[PDB]
Design an enzyme around this catalytic site. Structure first.
Site, short mmCIF file in Angstrom:
data_model
loop_
_atom_site.label_atom_id
_atom_site.label_comp_id
_atom_site.label_asym_id
_atom_site.label_seq_id
_atom_site.Cartn_x
_atom_site.Cartn_y
_atom_site.Cartn_z
N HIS A 255 -55.71 46.87 -9.90
CA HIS A 255 -55.32 47.42 -8.60
C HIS A 255 -56.22 47.09 -7.42
O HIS A 255 -55.82 47.41 -6.29
CB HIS A 255 -55.15 48.95 -8.70
CG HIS A 255 -54.09 49.35 -9.65
ND1 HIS A 255 -52.76 49.06 -9.43
CD2 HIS A 255 -54.14 50.03 -10.82
CE1 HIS A 255 -52.04 49.53 -10.44
NE2 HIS A 255 -52.87 50.10 -11.30
N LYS B 58 -45.29 42.85 -16.37
CA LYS B 58 -45.39 44.21 -15.88
C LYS B 58 -44.39 44.36 -14.73
O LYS B 58 -44.43 43.56 -13.79
CB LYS B 58 -46.79 44.56 -15.40
CG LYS B 58 -46.91 46.03 -15.09
CD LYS B 58 -48.29 46.45 -14.59
CE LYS B 58 -48.27 47.96 -14.33
NZ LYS B 58 -49.50 48.45 -13.66
N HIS C 89 -56.03 55.47 -12.45
CA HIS C 89 -54.59 55.20 -12.49
C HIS C 89 -54.08 55.18 -11.06
O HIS C 89 -54.50 56.00 -10.22
CB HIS C 89 -53.89 56.27 -13.34
CG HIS C 89 -52.42 56.43 -13.07
ND1 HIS C 89 -51.46 55.64 -13.67
CD2 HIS C 89 -51.74 57.34 -12.31
CE1 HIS C 89 -50.26 56.03 -13.28
NE2 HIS C 89 -50.40 57.05 -12.45
N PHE C 90 -53.20 54.22 -10.76
CA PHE C 90 -52.53 54.18 -9.46
C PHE C 90 -51.19 54.91 -9.58
O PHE C 90 -50.32 54.49 -10.36
CB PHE C 90 -52.33 52.73 -9.00
CG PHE C 90 -51.90 52.63 -7.58
CD1 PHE C 90 -50.56 52.77 -7.25
CD2 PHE C 90 -52.84 52.48 -6.58
CE1 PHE C 90 -50.17 52.71 -5.92
CE2 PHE C 90 -52.45 52.44 -5.24
CZ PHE C 90 -51.13 52.54 -4.92
N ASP C 91 -51.01 56.00 -8.83
CA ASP C 91 -49.80 56.81 -9.04
C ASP C 91 -48.66 56.49 -8.08
O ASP C 91 -47.49 56.48 -8.50
CB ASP C 91 -50.13 58.31 -8.94
CG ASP C 91 -49.20 59.18 -9.78
OD1 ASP C 91 -49.01 58.89 -10.99
OD2 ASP C 91 -48.75 60.22 -9.26
N1 LIG Z 1 -52.99 62.01 -14.21
C1 LIG Z 1 -53.41 60.89 -14.88
N2 LIG Z 1 -54.70 60.67 -15.16
C2 LIG Z 1 -55.07 59.59 -15.81
N3 LIG Z 1 -54.21 58.68 -16.22
C3 LIG Z 1 -52.91 58.82 -15.99
C4 LIG Z 1 -52.45 59.95 -15.30
N4 LIG Z 1 -51.11 59.85 -15.18
C5 LIG Z 1 -50.72 58.75 -15.77
N5 LIG Z 1 -51.79 58.09 -16.27
C6 LIG Z 1 -51.76 56.82 -16.98
O1 LIG Z 1 -50.62 56.06 -16.52
C7 LIG Z 1 -50.15 55.34 -17.67
C8 LIG Z 1 -48.76 54.78 -17.44
O2 LIG Z 1 -48.39 54.05 -18.61
P1 LIG Z 1 -47.67 52.68 -18.18
O3 LIG Z 1 -46.49 52.38 -19.23
O4 LIG Z 1 -47.05 52.78 -16.84
O5 LIG Z 1 -48.71 51.46 -18.24
P2 LIG Z 1 -49.68 51.49 -17.10
O6 LIG Z 1 -50.50 50.23 -17.15
O7 LIG Z 1 -48.91 51.39 -15.79
P3 LIG Z 1 -48.89 52.24 -14.55
O8 LIG Z 1 -48.46 51.50 -13.32
O9 LIG Z 1 -48.14 53.55 -14.67
O10 LIG Z 1 -50.37 52.77 -14.20
P4 LIG Z 1 -51.60 51.93 -14.07
O11 LIG Z 1 -51.30 50.52 -13.64
O12 LIG Z 1 -52.62 52.56 -13.16
O13 LIG Z 1 -52.15 52.02 -15.49
P5 LIG Z 1 -51.97 52.90 -16.69
O14 LIG Z 1 -52.97 52.39 -17.71
O15 LIG Z 1 -52.38 54.24 -16.17
O16 LIG Z 1 -50.54 52.73 -17.10
C9 LIG Z 1 -50.16 56.44 -18.75
O17 LIG Z 1 -50.01 55.87 -20.05
C10 LIG Z 1 -51.57 57.01 -18.51
O18 LIG Z 1 -52.55 56.25 -19.23
#
Ligand SMILES: Nc1ncnc2c1ncn2[C@@H]1O[C@H](COP(=O)(O)OP2(=O)OP(=O)(O)OP(=O)(O)OP(=O)(O)O2)[C@@H](O)[C@H]1O
Length: 124
Positions: free
Chosen positions: A12, A41, A119-121
């Site tokens: 990110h 992705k 994490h990017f929300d």
């Molecule tokens: N409140 C939270 N605190 C900490 N972690 C969280 C939380 N809320 C969701 N998370 C994480 O958000 C993931 C989404 O799983 P996902 O299938 O989307 O793969 P991601 O690469 O893609 P995202 O774009 O969402 O996200 P990100 O590119 O940033 O990467 P992340 O590694 O976070 O996830 C979940 O598993 C969690 O670990």
């Protein structure tokens, strides 16, 4: 392993450009940051601000996360970002993205000691 903080930086953070490099930006960046190795992705955002400015978001406006957890934070200022979204043409691992530049408030989830983005929300 790669820490969650480091994974956030890899997925990110892009402080080296002020905005979206070009129409090629997402195609190049999604690949170079390793977001297309297992699969394309589907969506991903890059933030063109300093690491310290993005880390500082963890002490800014507390908001609910999309998953219902309480550890998300919205930046008080708008930030330069680039949204990458997979096209229709795209078939792995020739993943193809549309590149869109914007200035929006970011929402990140933060964890740990020190308390840092993991994490990017959302952007709003
Ligand atoms: N409140 C939270 N605190 C900490 N972690 C969280 C939380 N809320 C969701 N998370 C994480 O958000 C993931 C989404 O799983 P996902 O299938 O989307 O793969 P991601 O690469 O893609 P995202 O774009 O969402 O996200 P990100 O590119 O940033 O990467 P992340 O590694 O976070 O996830 C979940 O598993 C969690 O670990």
């Amino acid at each position: 392993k790669e820490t969650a903080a480091a994974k956030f930086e890899r997925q990110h953070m892009d402080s080296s450009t002020s905005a979206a490099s070009s129409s090629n930006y997402c195609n190049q960046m999604m690949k170079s940051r390793n977001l297309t190795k297992d699969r394309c992705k589907p969506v991903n955002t890059f933030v063109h601000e300093s690491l310290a400015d993005v880390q500082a978001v963890c002490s800014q406006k507390n908001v609910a996360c999309k998953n219902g957890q309480t550890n998300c934070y919205q930046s008080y200022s708008t930030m330069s970002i680039t949204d990458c979204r997979e096209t229709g043409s795209s078939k792995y691992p020739n993943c193809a993205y549309k590149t869109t530049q914007a200035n929006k408030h970011i929402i990140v989830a933060c964890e740990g000691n020190p308390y840092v983005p993991v994490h990017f929300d959302a952007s709003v």
